[PDB]
Design a protein around this ligand. Structure first.
Ligand SMILES: Nc1nc2c(ncn2[C@@H]2O[C@H](COP(=O)(O)OP(=O)(O)OP(=O)(O)O)[C@@H](O)[C@H]2O)c(=O)[nH]1
Ligand SMILES: Nc1nc2c(ncn2[C@@H]2O[C@H](COP(=O)(O)OP(=O)(O)OP(=O)(O)O)[C@@H](O)[C@H]2O)c(=O)[nH]1
Ligand SMILES: Nc1nc2c(ncn2[C@@H]2O[C@H](COP(=O)(O)OP(=O)(O)OP(=O)(O)O)[C@@H](O)[C@H]2O)c(=O)[nH]1
Lengths: 438, 91, 427, 100, 427
C-alpha cells in the first residue's frame, strides 16, 4: 500500500529516530507495552497506521526501521530504555569498533563486513512490503561514525535498486563551529561521493536551532530533548499527507518531481513556522497571514543564509489543521505582490501547496503548543552558495598544509580523490551562479 | 536498576554478571536469576557492621549375589527396602 | 569486546598505579574484600574495560606490575588492596637497579623481558580485543625508563595496531635528585619519540605550586600528588565506560589531536580544586569552571605556554549540562585570545560531554592541550647534556657496561631535530 | 596486632605456619590508622588535612616560602573516628576495611 | 563385567600404589576400616571395575603386591590403610636385591615367579572379563625392573588378547642416584619395547619444577609428590567408571593413540594446579583450562616439547561441559600453531568429556600426548651406555651372574634403531 522504510544510519541517527518514534507512537496511541487499550484495532494491520507499523496477528506493531551503529554504548542504552520490547531485536545492528572520525576508516577497512547483514535486513523487509515507495535515511555529516558508512550504503542500495526514491536528512556543519577538525574533511568526502546518487538531501544548522529557542520559545538552556522533538515534528508534518486524509493530497514523489529543477542541486531549506510556547498560544492569536510572514521571515530559517543574499527559486508549503483555501490563496497573492522577496525570473509560478485536515499533535509535558493551524515550508533557493564557499577557503588551507594526512595514508587512503573532490565542489558552485544568472 | 528485570534486551553488547557459576544456558532466566540472587546477597552483603528396579541392571549394590532363590524383580525391591534396614549404608 | 590492560613500571609507577587503582575501586564501589557493592547498575554495566572476572564474585585487575627491589612491591601489597592485586602477576627482579640506564637496558632486562612478555601475552590471550595499552612510569628515574623503553620496543611489533599511551612523570627542572638524570632522559626520549604515539607529561614542581597555591594545607604527601594525577587519568579514561553522547576512543582524541607523526607530548590540568571554605563559598557554574579551567595558574604541566602557542586543545566535561554553554564558552575564548592560537586550522577545540559526574561532585572537567611549550624543557635538558658530555663526566660506568658515545651523538641529533621541528611550524 | 601508644595507630603482621602454601611477606597491613567502620567513600583527597589556612601573601614577592595566615572557626572539619585504645577486649567486633 | 587387576612392583611401586589406592578410596568415600558409606549411587555402581566384595561391606582391592625386602611392605601395611590390603596377597623372598638386574632376571626371580603367577591367575579366575593389566614399577629401579621384565614376559603369552599398561619413571638428567642405572634401563627397555603396548614415563626433575613453580609450599614430601603423579592415571581411568556422553576403554584410547607398531611412550599432562591464594584468585573457564593445560611449564614428564614436533594428542575433560567450547579451543590451538603439528595425519586430536568431576574441583582436564619429544631421553641413555662400556666398568657382577656382552650389543642396536626410526618419521 503506502509505506516507507526507515534507515537510521548513525549514532546521531538513533538520537532523532528515538525522538521521532516517541512522537510516532503517540498519535495512534501505541502503548509502550505494544497493544491498544480495550478498544479494537488488531487485524492484518489495515488502517492509516500500516504505513509505519506491522501490527500483525501477533498484535504488536513492527517498527519498519533499521538502526545501525558503531559504538555499543548508545544503542545499548536505548534498548535498555522504554520502547525496547516494541523494537525488534536484530533490527538493531551494532558493531564493536569506531570509525575514529575518519571517513576513510568508516569507508574501506570497516564497512565491508556489515553490508551483507544490513542488506539482509533490508531485503527481509522488502519481501513483505508491497508499495516500496521510499526510504527515510538519516545520517549526520560530521558523524564521527555516521559520515562514511551511510555513503557506501547509499551506493550499494542505489545500484541494487534503481527505481525508487531517496530522501536524506542530515545535520549540517556549523558555519563558525566545527567540533571535529575532521569535519571539513569528511564533509567534502561525503558530498563528492553522494551528490550523484542522493535523490533529495536536506540540511539544517544546529546553531540556529539553538537560536530560535530563545528567540521565541524562550529557552536559555535547551537540549537534545527539545531539538530532536523539533526535527521529529518536522518529519511528522512532511508525512501527514502520507498518513491522514484531507481535501487534496501530495506525496514524496511529487516533492521530488516539483522541487528539484536540475540534476546536481537538490538542496532546499526547511522551516517550521508556528514554533511558539504555550503562554504565547493561549492569549495570542494564530492565523494564516502572520504565520506566512513568520515562514518567509529570514531569521526564522534555521540556516544562516539570508534569502536577500539570494533569490527564492522553488517553494512547497504544506498546511495542516483546520484551514480553508480562501485565505491561503489571498496570502500567496500578498506574498507574490511584495517586492523584497526577489524571485528568480525563470518560473513565474513556484508554489506547491498541500492541505491536510488533521491537526498536529503535542506530547504531554513537552514544549510545543496545543496548535490548531500549522504550516511547514520547504523551499529551494540560491542563497546557500556561501556555505560551501566558506567550506573551501579552509579546506584549501588544511590540505595545503597536509596536516593529519599521515592518518589517512596510514589507514590506507590516497589523495587523487582528495584532489577531485574540490573540482566536484567547484562544479556545484559554478553551476549555482550559472543557474542564478538569467 | 533494570526494569523488565527478567531479561535485558536480546543481544546485549554490554556484558552481564554470572557468565560463571551458573551459565551454559540462555539469556533470560540466567540474567534475571543472576541479578536477583546477586542483589539479594549484596543486600545481606550490606547488612550490619556488628519401587521395582527392572532386570539386567549392571552395578552392584551390597550383598545381592550372596542371597538368591527369587526373581530379579521381587529380590531387587526386597533389597530396595532392606537397604533402609540392615545394609542401610546407601544414600 | 574492547578492554584495557594496564602497565605499571618503576617505583614511581608502583605508587601511581596503587593510587590510580584504589581511586577506580572507590568509583565503582569495590571494597578491600573484593566483592561488588551494588549501588549503581550503570557503574556495573561496563566493568570489562578494566576488570576481568574471577570466581566467587571477585574482580581481579588486568595489571602488569614490574619492579626490581622487593620492598616496593611489599609496600604495595601491604597497602589497602594488595590482596586485590595478584601474587602470580607480581614479577620482579633479582638484583638492584643501580639507577643506571645501561643496566636497565642491556644487563638484567635481557633476561626479564622473557617473563614479562609471557605474562602480558597470557593476559592478552585471556582477553578478546584491545584498545591498546597505557604504561605509567618515569622517563628520568632508573627503573621506569630503563624497562619502559625495552617493553615498548618489544610490544610494538607483536601488536602493531593498538594505542600505545605513555604516561610519564617528568624530572624536576631545578632539583631532579638523580644526577645522571640528564643522560637517562636523553637516552629514553630517543626511543620514546620513535615508538609511542601519545604522551602525558607531569612535573612535581608544578604539583608543589598547585598544592600550595590552591590546596592550602601545608602538609601533603607524594600520595596527594599521585591523587591529583590519578584524577587526571580518571577523567581522560572513564569516557569509554559511561553513556552519554561524546567521543570516547583514545584513537578518536588522537585523530582529533595530533596533526603530525612527531607530535606526541601533552600537558594535563584539572577542573576545580577547592579550598577548605570555597566548597560552601562557591557556586558551580559552567562559566566559572571555564574561567578557572583555562587558567595559567591552574596549569600543572611544566611552565607557562605564555611563551609558546596553542596548536590544539581537547576538553572533556562531566555532569548534567547541555550543549550551548560549552558552545558559547568556546566561542568566547577563541576571540578572548585569538592571537594565542595557530592560524593553520581553526575550530581548534575538540569537545566531549559526559553525563556521570564523579562520586561527590556535580560539575567537573578535564583539559588537555597540544601547545608549543616543550621547547624550553628539552632545551634545558639540551644544555645540561652538552655541558656534561663536554668532558665525559660519569662516562666510565656506561662504558664499562659496554655503551658508546656514538649513541649519545645520534640521540642528541634526534632531540635537536625535535627542537627545530617544534620551532618551525609555530614560528 | 601491635597498637602503638605514641601514634594512635595500628599494625598487622601474619603468623602463617610452615607448608601453609602462602607467600613469605609478613607485614600484611600498613601502620596507618584503622577507620572505625567500613571503607569510607574516598573523601576526595585535596581536602584531607588538619589545619585551615586562610590566605597566602607570599608569591607577591620572595622572602620566605610565603606566609600562612590562620583562621578562628575551622569550618569543614569532617568526622572520621578511629579505633582507639578504649574499645579493646577479649571478644568484640572490629571491622578492618571489610574484615569481620 | 569388565575389571582391572593392579600389579605393584619395585619399592617405588610400593609407595606409588600406596598413595594411589587411598586416592581411589577417598574419591569413592570409604573409611579406613572399609565400611563404605554410600554417598553417590553412581560410584557405588561402578566400584566393581576394581573391587571385589566379601561380606561386611569391606571393599577388597584386586592388587598383587610383590617385593623382596620386607621392611617397606611392613611400612605400607602399618600405614593408614594397611588393613585394606590382603596379607594373603603379600609374597616376597628371603634374599636381598643388590639393586641388580642380573639377580632379578635370573637369580632371585626364578623362585618367586611361580607364586606371583599362581596368585595372579587365581585372581584371574576370580574375575570375569578383563580389559588387561597395569603394572606400576620403575625402569631405572632395580628390583622393579628385575621382576617386571620376567613377569611381563610370562603373562604376555598366557593372555595374548588384553591391554598391558606399564607405568614407569625415567632417570633424572642431572643425577640418577643408582649408577648402574643406565645398564639396568637399557636391559629393561630391550624387553619392554618388544612386549608392551602402552607406557607412561614420569620424572622427578620436572616434578620438582612443578613444586617450585606452582606448589610454592617450601618443604614438600615424596608422598605428596606421589599424590601429584597418581592424580594423572586416576584421571585417565576416571571415565571407565562413570556415565556421560563419552567413552573410556584403554583400547578406545590406544587405537586413537598409536600410529605405528613400535610406539609406546607417553608423557602425562595435568590440569589446574592452584597456588597459595589462586583458589580465590582464579577464574575457572574452559578457555583458561585449555591455555594452562597446553603449556611448556605444566608438562612434567621428560623435556620441553618446544624442541621437536607433536604426533598425536588426547585430552579428557571432567565436569559439566559442552561440545562447542572444546571444539573451538581445538581449532584455536590448531590454527594458532599449525606448524608445530605434523602434517602427515591432520585432525591429530581426541577429546573425551565425562560429567562427574574429581572431588574438590568442579572442572578438570587430563592430557596425554605422544610427540617427537622422546629423542633426548634415549639419546642421553645411549651416550651414557657407550661411555661406561668403553672400559666395561661395573661389569664383573653381571658376567659373574652369567650373561654375555652380546646381549648388551643387541640391546644397544635396538635402541639405536628406535632413535633412527623416530628420527625418520619426524624428518
Ligand atoms: N543528531 C544528533 N546530533 C547531535 C546530538 N548531540 C550533538 N550532535 C551533533 O551530532 C554529531 C554527532 O556525530 P559524530 O560526532 O561523528 O558521532 P559518531 O561518529 O557516530 O560517534 P559519537 O561521537 O560517539 O556519537 C556531532 O558532530 C554533534 O555536533 C544529538 O543528540 N543528536
Ligand atoms: N614512590 C615515590 N616516587 C617518587 C617520589 N618523588 C618522586 N618520585 C619519582 O620516582 C622516580 C623513580 O621511580 P622508579 O622508576 O620506580 O625508580 P628507578 O627506576 O630505580 O629510578 P631512581 O629514581 O634512580 O631510583 C624518581 O625519578 C622520582 O621522580 C615519591 O615521593 N615517592
Ligand atoms: N618408594 C620410593 N622409590 C623411589 C623414590 N625415589 C626414587 N625411587 C626409585 O624407584 C625405584 C623402584 O623401586 P624398586 O624397583 O623397588 O628398587 P630396587 O629394585 O630394590 O633397586 P634400586 O633401584 O637400586 O633401589 C627405586 O629403585 C628408586 O630408584 C622414593 O622416594 N620412594
Amino acid at each position: 500500500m503506502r509505506e516507507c522504510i526507515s534507515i537510521h544510519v548513525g549514532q546521531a541517527g538513533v538520537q532523532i529516530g528515538n525522538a521521532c518514534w516517541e512522537l510516532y507512537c503517540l498519535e495512534h496511541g501505541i502503548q509502550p507495552d505494544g497493544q491498544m487499550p480495550s478498544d479494537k484495532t488488531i487485524g492484518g494491520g489495515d488502517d492509516s497506521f500500516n504505513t509505519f507499523f506491522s501490527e500483525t496477528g501477533a498484535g504488536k506493531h513492527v517498527p519498519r526501521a533499521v538502526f545501525v551503529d558503531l559504538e555499543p554504548t548508545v544503542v545499548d542504552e536505548v534498548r535498555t530504555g522504554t520502547y525496547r520490547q516494541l523494537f525488534h531485536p536484530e533490527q538493531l545492528i551494532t558493531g564493536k569498533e569506531d570509525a575514529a572520525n575518519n571517513y576513510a576508516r568508516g569507508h574501506y577497512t570497516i564497512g565491508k563486513e556489515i553490508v551483507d547483514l544490513v542488506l539482509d535486513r533490508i531485503r527481509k523487509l522488502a519481501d513483505l512490503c508491497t508499495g516500496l515507495q521510499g526510504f527515510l535515511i538519516f545520517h549526520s555529516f560530521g558523524g564521527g561514525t555516521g559520515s562514511g558508512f551511510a555513503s557506501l550504503l547509499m551506493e550499494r542500495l542505489s545500484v541494487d535498486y534503481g527505481k525508487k526514491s531517496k530522501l536524506e536528512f542530515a545535520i549540517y556543519p556549523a558555519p563558525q563551529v566545527s567540533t571535529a577538525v575532521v569535519e571539513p574533511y569528511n564533509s567534502i568526502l561525503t558530498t563528492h561521493t553522494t551528490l550523484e546518487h542522493s535523490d533529495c538531501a536536506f540540511m539544517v544548522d544546529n546553531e540556529a536551532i539553538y537560536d530560535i529557542c530563545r528567540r521565541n520559545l524562550d529557552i536559555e538552556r535547551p537540549t537534545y530533548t527539545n531539538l530532536n522533538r523539533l526535527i521529529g515534528q518536522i518529519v511528522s508534518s512532511i508525512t501527514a499527507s502520507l498518513r491522514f486524509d484531507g481535501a487534496l493530497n501530495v506525496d514524496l514523489t511529487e516533492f521530488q518531481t516539483n522541487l528539484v529543477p536540475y540534476p546536481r542541486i537538490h538542496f532546499p531549506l526547511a522551516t517550521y513556522a508556528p514554533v511558539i510556547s504555550a503562554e504565547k498560544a493561549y492569549h495570542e492569536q494564530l492565523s494564516v497571514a502572520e504565520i506566512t510572514n513568520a515562514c518567509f521571515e529570514p531569521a526564522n530559517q534555521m540556516v544562516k543564509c539570508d534569502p536577500r543574499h539570494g533569490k527564492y527559486m522553488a517553494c512547497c508549503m504544506l498546511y495542516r489543521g483546520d484551514v480553508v483555501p480562501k485565505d491561503v490563496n489571498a496570502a500567496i497573492a500578498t506574498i507574490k505582490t511584495k517586492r523584497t522577496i526577489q524571485f528568480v525570473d525563470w518560473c513565474p509560478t513556484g508554489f506547491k501547496v498541500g492541505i491536510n485536515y488533521q491537526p498536529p499533535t503535542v506530547v504531554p509535558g513537552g514544549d510545543l503548543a496545543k496548535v490548531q493551524r500549522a504550516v511547514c515550508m520547504l523551499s529551494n533557493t540560491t542563497a546557500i552558495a556561501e556555505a560551501w564557499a566558506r567550506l573551501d577557503h579552509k579546506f584549501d588551507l588544511m590540505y595545503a598544509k597536509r596536516a593529519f594526512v599521515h592518518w589517512y595514508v596510514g589507514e590506507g587512503m590516497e589523495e587523487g580523490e582528495f584532489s577531485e573532490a574540490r573540482e566536484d565542489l567547484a562544479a556545484l558552485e559554478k553551476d549555482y551562479e550559472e543557474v542564478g544568472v538569467d | 536498576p533494570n526494569l523488565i528485570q527478567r531479561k535485558a534486551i536480546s543481544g546485549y553488547a554490554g556484558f552481564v554478571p554470572r557468565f560463571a557459576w551458573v551459565m551454559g544456558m540462555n539469556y533470560r532466566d540466567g540474567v534475571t536469576q543472576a541479578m536477583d540472587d546477586f542483589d539479594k546477597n549484596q543486600f545481606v552483603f550490606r547488612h550490619p557492621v556488628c519401587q521395582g528396579l527392572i532386570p539386567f541392571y549392571m552395578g552392584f549394590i551390597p550383598s545381592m549375589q550372596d542371597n538368591y532363590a527369587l526373581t530379579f524383580g521381587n529380590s531387587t525391591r526386597r533389597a530396595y527396602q532392606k537397604e533402609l534396614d540392615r545394609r542401610s549404608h546407601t544414600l | 569486546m574492547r578492554e584495557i590492560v594496564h602497565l605499571q613500571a618503576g617505583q614511581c609507577g608502583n605508587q601511581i598505579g596503587a593510587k590510580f587503582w584504589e581511586v577506580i575501586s572507590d568509583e565503582h564501589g569495590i571494597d578491600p574484600t573484593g566483592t561488588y557493592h551494588g549501588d549503581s547498575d550503570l557503574q556495573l554495566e561496563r566493568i570489562n574495560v578494566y576488570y576481568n572476572e574471577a570466581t566467587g564474585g571477585k574482580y581481579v585487575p588486568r595489571a602488569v606490575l614490574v619492579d626490581l627491589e622487593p620492598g616496593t612491591m611489599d609496600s604495595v601489597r601491604s597497602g589497602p588492596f594488595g590482596q586485590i592485586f595478584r601474587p602470580d602477576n607480581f614479577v620482579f627482579g633479582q638484583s638492584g637497579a643501580g639507577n643506571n640506564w645501561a643496566k636497565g637496558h642491556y644487563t638484567e632486562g635481557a633476561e626479564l623481558v622473557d617473563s614479562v612478555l609471557d605474562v602480558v601475552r597470557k593476559e592478552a590471550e585471556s582477553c578478546d580485543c584491545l584498545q591498546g595499552f597505557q604504561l605509567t612510569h618515569s622517563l628520568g628515574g632508573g627503573t621506569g625508563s630503563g624497562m619502559g623503553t625495552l617493553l615498548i620496543s618489544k610490544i610494538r611489533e607483536e601488536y602493531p595496531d593498538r594505542i600505545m599511551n605513555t604516561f610519564s612523570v617528568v624530572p624536576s627542572p631545578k632539583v631532579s635528585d638523580t644526577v645522571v638524570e640528564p643522560y637517562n632522559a636523553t637516552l629514553s626520549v630517543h626511543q620514546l619519540v620513535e615508538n609511542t604515539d601519545e604522551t602525558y607529561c607531569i612535573d612535581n614542581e608544578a604539583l608543589y605550586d598547585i598544592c600550595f597555591r590552591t590546596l592550602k594545607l601545608t602538609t601533603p604527601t607524594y600520595g596527594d600528588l599521585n591523587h591529583l594525577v590519578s584524577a587526571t587519568m580518571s577523567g581522560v579514561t572513564t569516557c569509554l565506560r559511561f553513556p552519554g553522547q561524546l567521543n570516547a576512543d583514545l584513537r578518536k582524541l588522537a585523530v582529533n589531536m595530533v596533526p603530525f607523526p612527531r607530535l606526541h607530548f601533552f600537558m594535563p590540568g584539572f577542573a576545580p580544586l577547592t579550598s577548605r571554605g570555597s566548597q560552601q563559598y562557591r557556586a558551580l557554574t559552567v562559566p566559572e569552571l571555564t574561567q578557572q579551567m583555562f587558567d595559567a595558574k591552574n596549569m600543572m604541566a611544566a611552565c607557562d605556554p605564555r611563551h609558546g602557542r596553542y596548536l590544539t586543545v581537547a576538553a572533556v566535561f562531566r555532569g548534567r549540562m547541555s550543549m550551548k554553554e560549552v558552545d558559547e564558552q568556546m566561542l568566547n575564548v577563541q576571540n578572548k585570545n585569538s592571537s594565542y592560537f595557530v592560524e593553520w586550522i581553526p575550530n581548534n577545540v575538540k569537545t566531549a560531554v559526559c553525563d556521570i559526574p564523579p562520586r561527590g561532585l556535580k560539575m567537573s572537567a578535564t583539559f588537555i592541550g597540544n601547545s608549543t611549550a616543550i621547547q624550553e624543557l628539552f632545551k634545558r635538558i639540551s644544555e645540561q647534556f652538552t655541558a656534561m658530555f663536554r668532558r665525559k663526566a660519569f662516562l666510565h660506568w656506561y662504558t664499562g657496561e659496554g655503551m658508546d658515545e656514538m649513541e649519545f651523538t645520534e640521540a642528541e641529533s634526534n632531540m635537536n631535530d625535535l627542537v627545530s621541528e617544534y620551532q618551525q611550524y609555530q614560528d | 596486632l601491635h597498637y602503638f601508644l605514641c601514634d594512635g595507630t595500628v599494625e598487622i603482621r601474619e603468623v602463617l605456619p610452615s607448608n601453609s602454601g602462602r607467600d613469605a611477606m609478613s607485614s600484611f597491613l600498613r601502620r596507618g590508622k584503622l577507620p572505625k567502620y567500613g571503607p569510607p567513600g574516598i573523601y576526595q583527597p585535596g581536602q584531607i588535612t588538619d589545619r585551615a589556612v586562610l590566605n597566602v601573601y607570599g608569591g607577591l614577592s620572595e622572602w620566605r616560602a610565603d606566609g600562612y595566615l590562620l583562621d578562628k572557626y575551622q569550618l569543614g572539619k569532617v568526622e572520621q573516628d578511629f579505633y582507639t585504645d578504649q574499645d579493646l577486649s577479649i571478644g568484640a567486633t572490629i571491622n578492618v576495611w571489610g574484615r569481620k
